[PDB]
Amino acid sequence: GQGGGTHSQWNKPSKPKTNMKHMAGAAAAGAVVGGLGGYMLGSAMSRPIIHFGSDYEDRYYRENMHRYPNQVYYRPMDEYSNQNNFVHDCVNITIKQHTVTTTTKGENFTETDVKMMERVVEQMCITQYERESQAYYGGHHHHHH
């Protein structure tokens, strides 16, 4: 037999729209340190893989590795009586420099993300503490004769 039910469409359901897409004022360029004033950069060696409790959680952190920085900026002068220039100043300064990105371009990090990077920053800071500072301050330079 046969009957109705068949139907057709020119190509696709559609609705009208203004379709204009002119835009300006949503771009920036340059290596802007902001107001850091020349803080010193650590060592570009891959950060450790943080274990929370089990690999299902670490798996999540591994995907966001491209979201977090892999280096830390610290004060190029130990003004304090011990290396308080390290760790303490670096956990702030790096995060404060990165958060500017969200006010400039709107980057959409969520609270879970920041909680994980606040842990990795500490570890990458512990890593150069024995490397960069050893080469510069540890290697006590002295004049020739």
Tab-separated table of all heavy atoms in Angstrom, residues 42-63:
chain	number	residue	atom	x	y	z
A	42	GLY	N	62.681	30.676	37.098
A	42	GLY	CA	63.268	29.360	37.364
A	42	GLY	C	63.535	28.410	36.204
A	42	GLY	O	63.697	28.817	35.062
A	43	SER	N	63.627	27.120	36.513
A	43	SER	CA	64.210	26.147	35.570
A	43	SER	C	63.148	25.392	34.721
A	43	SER	O	62.262	24.777	35.309
A	43	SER	CB	65.073	25.210	36.418
A	43	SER	OG	65.534	25.915	37.528
A	44	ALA	N	63.191	25.429	33.373
A	44	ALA	CA	62.125	24.817	32.566
A	44	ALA	C	62.198	23.284	32.418
A	44	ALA	O	62.248	22.770	31.303
A	44	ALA	CB	62.111	25.470	31.167
A	45	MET	N	62.191	22.562	33.526
A	45	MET	CA	62.255	21.104	33.510
A	45	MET	C	60.863	20.644	33.965
A	45	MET	O	60.273	21.283	34.830
A	45	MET	CB	63.426	20.707	34.427
A	45	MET	CG	64.742	21.217	33.840
A	45	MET	SD	65.204	20.296	32.359
A	45	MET	CE	65.632	21.633	31.229
A	46	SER	N	60.312	19.585	33.370
A	46	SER	CA	58.945	19.170	33.670
A	46	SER	C	58.664	18.935	35.151
A	46	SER	O	59.424	18.285	35.864
A	46	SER	CB	58.637	17.890	32.903
A	46	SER	OG	59.623	16.912	33.177
A	47	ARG	N	57.534	19.484	35.577
A	47	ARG	CA	57.065	19.402	36.958
A	47	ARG	C	56.725	17.962	37.352
A	47	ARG	O	56.416	17.138	36.484
A	47	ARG	CB	55.823	20.295	37.103
A	47	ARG	CG	54.588	19.779	36.368
A	47	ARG	CD	53.683	20.917	35.923
A	47	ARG	NE	53.545	20.907	34.457
A	47	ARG	CZ	52.949	21.846	33.733
A	47	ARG	NH1	52.425	22.916	34.263
A	47	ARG	NH2	52.886	21.702	32.442
A	48	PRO	N	56.767	17.646	38.661
A	48	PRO	CA	56.405	16.276	39.039
A	48	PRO	C	54.921	15.982	38.831
A	48	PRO	O	54.092	16.891	38.700
A	48	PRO	CB	56.773	16.226	40.525
A	48	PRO	CG	56.590	17.616	40.988
A	48	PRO	CD	57.110	18.453	39.851
A	49	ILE	N	54.587	14.703	38.815
A	49	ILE	CA	53.212	14.267	38.644
A	49	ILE	C	52.641	14.101	40.053
A	49	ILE	O	53.073	13.237	40.815
A	49	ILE	CB	53.157	12.934	37.835
A	49	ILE	CG1	53.826	13.090	36.444
A	49	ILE	CG2	51.735	12.468	37.660
A	49	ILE	CD1	53.263	14.221	35.529
A	50	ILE	N	51.689	14.953	40.406
A	50	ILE	CA	51.110	14.945	41.742
A	50	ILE	C	50.103	13.818	41.924
A	50	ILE	O	49.126	13.718	41.190
A	50	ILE	CB	50.339	16.274	42.018
A	50	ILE	CG1	51.216	17.512	41.745
A	50	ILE	CG2	49.800	16.320	43.481
A	50	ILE	CD1	52.560	17.585	42.507
A	51	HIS	N	50.319	12.996	42.937
A	51	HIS	CA	49.346	11.978	43.303
A	51	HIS	C	48.484	12.567	44.399
A	51	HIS	O	48.997	13.142	45.351
A	51	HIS	CB	50.028	10.694	43.790
A	51	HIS	CG	50.407	9.772	42.676
A	51	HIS	ND1	50.523	8.385	42.812
A	51	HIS	CD2	50.661	10.010	41.366
A	51	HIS	CE1	50.814	7.865	41.625
A	51	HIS	NE2	50.895	8.826	40.746
A	52	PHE	N	47.179	12.420	44.248
A	52	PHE	CA	46.224	12.862	45.261
A	52	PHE	C	46.015	11.611	46.134
A	52	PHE	O	46.693	11.460	47.143
A	52	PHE	CB	44.936	13.380	44.584
A	52	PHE	CG	44.922	14.866	44.335
A	52	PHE	CD1	45.895	15.510	43.535
A	52	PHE	CD2	43.898	15.636	44.905
A	52	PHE	CE1	45.847	16.920	43.339
A	52	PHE	CE2	43.842	17.040	44.715
A	52	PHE	CZ	44.822	17.681	43.935
A	53	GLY	N	45.122	10.711	45.739
A	53	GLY	CA	44.940	9.451	46.431
A	53	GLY	C	45.074	8.259	45.501
A	53	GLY	O	45.553	7.201	45.898
A	54	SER	N	44.640	8.418	44.257
A	54	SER	CA	44.672	7.331	43.286
A	54	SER	C	44.793	7.887	41.877
A	54	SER	O	44.513	9.065	41.640
A	54	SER	CB	43.387	6.520	43.414
A	54	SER	OG	43.586	5.420	44.283
A	55	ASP	N	45.197	7.042	40.936
A	55	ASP	CA	45.373	7.480	39.551
A	55	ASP	C	44.086	8.068	38.867
A	55	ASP	O	44.239	8.696	37.829
A	55	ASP	CB	46.355	6.570	38.672
A	55	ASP	CG	47.732	7.201	38.537
A	55	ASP	OD1	48.561	7.054	39.462
A	55	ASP	OD2	47.988	7.843	37.489
A	56	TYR	N	42.833	7.903	39.370
A	56	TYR	CA	41.689	8.424	38.620
A	56	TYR	C	41.672	9.941	38.738
A	56	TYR	O	41.146	10.653	37.878
A	56	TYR	CB	40.384	7.865	39.195
A	56	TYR	CG	40.534	6.489	39.812
A	56	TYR	CD1	40.451	6.316	41.210
A	56	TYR	CD2	40.764	5.353	39.008
A	56	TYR	CE1	40.603	5.028	41.795
A	56	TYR	CE2	40.919	4.066	39.593
A	56	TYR	CZ	40.842	3.920	40.979
A	56	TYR	OH	41.002	2.679	41.540
A	57	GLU	N	42.251	10.416	39.829
A	57	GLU	CA	42.310	11.836	40.146
A	57	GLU	C	43.498	12.481	39.433
A	57	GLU	O	43.406	13.575	38.887
A	57	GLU	CB	42.508	11.989	41.642
A	57	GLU	CG	41.430	11.356	42.481
A	57	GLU	CD	41.842	11.345	43.924
A	57	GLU	OE1	42.811	10.616	44.225
A	57	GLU	OE2	41.243	12.053	44.752
A	58	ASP	N	44.618	11.770	39.441
A	58	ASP	CA	45.856	12.223	38.796
A	58	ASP	C	45.604	12.335	37.288
A	58	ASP	O	46.060	13.259	36.623
A	58	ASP	CB	46.956	11.205	39.110
A	58	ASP	CG	48.337	11.636	38.635
A	58	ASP	OD1	48.486	12.666	37.956
A	58	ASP	OD2	49.292	10.900	38.946
A	59	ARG	N	44.824	11.399	36.761
A	59	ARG	CA	44.422	11.406	35.350
A	59	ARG	C	43.829	12.772	34.978
A	59	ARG	O	44.139	13.311	33.925
A	59	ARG	CB	43.423	10.251	35.138
A	59	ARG	CG	42.778	10.098	33.746
A	59	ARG	CD	41.566	11.012	33.537
A	59	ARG	NE	40.562	10.927	34.609
A	59	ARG	CZ	39.552	11.776	34.771
A	59	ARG	NH1	39.348	12.795	33.970
A	59	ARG	NH2	38.736	11.598	35.772
A	60	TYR	N	42.999	13.329	35.850
A	60	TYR	CA	42.382	14.637	35.610
A	60	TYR	C	43.441	15.741	35.577
A	60	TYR	O	43.423	16.631	34.718
A	60	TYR	CB	41.416	14.948	36.752
A	60	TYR	CG	40.407	16.034	36.465
A	60	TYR	CD1	39.068	15.706	36.200
A	60	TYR	CD2	40.778	17.398	36.476
A	60	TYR	CE1	38.106	16.722	35.933
A	60	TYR	CE2	39.819	18.417	36.222
A	60	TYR	CZ	38.495	18.066	35.948
A	60	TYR	OH	37.569	19.048	35.703
A	61	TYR	N	44.367	15.692	36.529
A	61	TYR	CA	45.408	16.714	36.632
A	61	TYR	C	46.285	16.698	35.373
A	61	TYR	O	46.746	17.748	34.903
A	61	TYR	CB	46.244	16.528	37.906
A	61	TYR	CG	47.695	16.969	37.773
A	61	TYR	CD1	48.046	18.329	37.773
A	61	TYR	CD2	48.720	16.023	37.659
A	61	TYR	CE1	49.400	18.739	37.705
A	61	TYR	CE2	50.078	16.417	37.540
A	61	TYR	CZ	50.408	17.778	37.581
A	61	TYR	OH	51.714	18.190	37.508
A	62	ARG	N	46.494	15.509	34.819
A	62	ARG	CA	47.347	15.340	33.631
A	62	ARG	C	46.780	16.048	32.394
A	62	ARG	O	47.533	16.526	31.553
A	62	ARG	CB	47.603	13.850	33.326
A	62	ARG	CG	48.577	13.167	34.322
A	62	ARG	CD	49.289	11.991	33.735
A	62	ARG	NE	48.467	10.764	33.787
A	62	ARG	CZ	48.348	9.964	34.849
A	62	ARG	NH1	48.940	10.197	35.987
A	62	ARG	NH2	47.611	8.896	34.771
A	63	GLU	N	45.468	16.141	32.281
A	63	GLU	CA	44.841	16.813	31.128
A	63	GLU	C	45.030	18.323	31.214
A	63	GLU	O	45.213	19.010	30.206
A	63	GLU	CB	43.335	16.511	31.109
A	63	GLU	CG	42.985	15.027	31.009
A	63	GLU	CD	41.498	14.768	31.233
A	63	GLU	OE1	40.673	15.459	30.604
A	63	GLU	OE2	41.155	13.877	32.048
